């Protein structure tokens, strides 16, 4: 029984921006979730649609680990039925979501004196993101009647803005690393199981 490589997702050196959130499929393995929900490193550990203890006792056809970085006061937005720039234009969870959301402060790694601007998020979009949708268009958005030709202008805007991650920022504006585990069960044979 080869163990599920959760350390690859959780202990990654670099994390992706929320608009370009990374997805890793976890399959054909046994996952010990006790080492996750016991750890005090996580500021947020909330499971929707399934209890943390039963995670070990259940098998699932596919497991998805979505990883990204946001700022503190936005961690609440990774939850079904949430509204906001992250949930509307960057990363949206469905109403029938089944899985868990884990978030931990990463100021010691993702913040730099003078500002860390490697982490971006989408400000504008014509329509709200569908659940589990990724947008990397980085095209010049239009918010006015005047048309545009990929040229920044009066009503032509770049759709992406970078977080200013500095160690002196407040907790709400400090970088938090977020991993979302999605446990989905199809007619396909089960691949990921826990102990028992």
């Amino acid at each position, epitope marked *: 029984t080869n163990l599920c490589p959760f350390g690859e997702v959780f202990n990654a050196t670099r994390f992706a921006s929320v608009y370009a959130w990374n997805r890793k499929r976890i399959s054909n393995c046994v996952a010990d979730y006790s080492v996750l929900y016991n750890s005090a490193s996580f500021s947020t550990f909330k499971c*929707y*649609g399934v209890s*943390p203890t039963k995670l070990n006792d259940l098998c699932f056809t596919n497991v998805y680990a979505d990883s990204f970085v946001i700022r503190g006061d936005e961690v609440r937005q990774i939850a*079904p*039925g949430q509204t906001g720039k992250i949930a509307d234009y960057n990363y949206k969870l469905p109403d029938d979501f089944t899985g868990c959301v884990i978030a931990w402060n990463s100021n010691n790694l993702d913040s730099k004196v003078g500002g860390n601007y490697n982490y971006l998020y989408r400000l504008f979009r014509k329509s709200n993101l569908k659940p589990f949708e990724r947008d990397i268009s980085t095209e010049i958005y239009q918010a006015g009647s005047t048309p545009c030709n990929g040229v920044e202008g009066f009503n032509c805007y770049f759709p992406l803005q970078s977080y200013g991650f500095q160690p002196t920022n407040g907790v709400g504006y400090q970088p938090y690393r977020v991993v979302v585990l999605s446990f989905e069960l199809l007619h396909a044979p089960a691949t990921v199981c826990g102990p028992k």
Partner: antibody
Amino acid sequence: QSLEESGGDLVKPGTSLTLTCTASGFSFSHNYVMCWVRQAPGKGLECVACIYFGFGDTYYASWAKGRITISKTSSTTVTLQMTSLTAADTATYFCARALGYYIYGDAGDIYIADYFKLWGPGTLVTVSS
Amino acid sequence: DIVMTQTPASVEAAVGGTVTIKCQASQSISKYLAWYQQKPGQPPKLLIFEASTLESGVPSRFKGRGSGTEFTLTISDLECADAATYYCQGYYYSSHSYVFGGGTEVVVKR
């Protein structure tokens, strides 16, 4: 992302009325909890009944003794039925949405549905002759 | 079984002042306490959840503090539009019950 209520009207004492909370922009999935909150004219808010879509069960207020029945009619509709209507039931009725989730603790696993972010405009129920 | 005692029934302060509303739970509710603003003829509007977390779009002059059986909502830099009724709602996970406070009215002194 919307909650619209209907069914309020003048009803004679001792009758029974059903109220309907309609969801718009979202589904009544297993992650949500619906509660009916009632406030009398010039008085505070009280929770009447709650439905837990995740478990398929319900919770009712202490002052209610079988007089309240809250049911899920559709994926976007929830009904509240009240019997033996008295003057103390004369009030405005809101349906509120709460997000339920699991956390781990020393007792074990805990289901939390702590606050109501989304409310409806409400409907007024008047019980008099 | 759980009571939320909210006091005083009315708080007053001039524009730019600070009002404090106290809410005491009969038994410990951990951090699960919420504050709601209500204007007449309107649904309650959520201000604070988890007893200290500001809802997005709510100004920072609304601050919730406390835990266990004692909570406070402080409104500094009072504006004229702050005149409304404010409620505290506790959640007891053991009984899955939602208890609302009596309510407090904010009066803008002038």
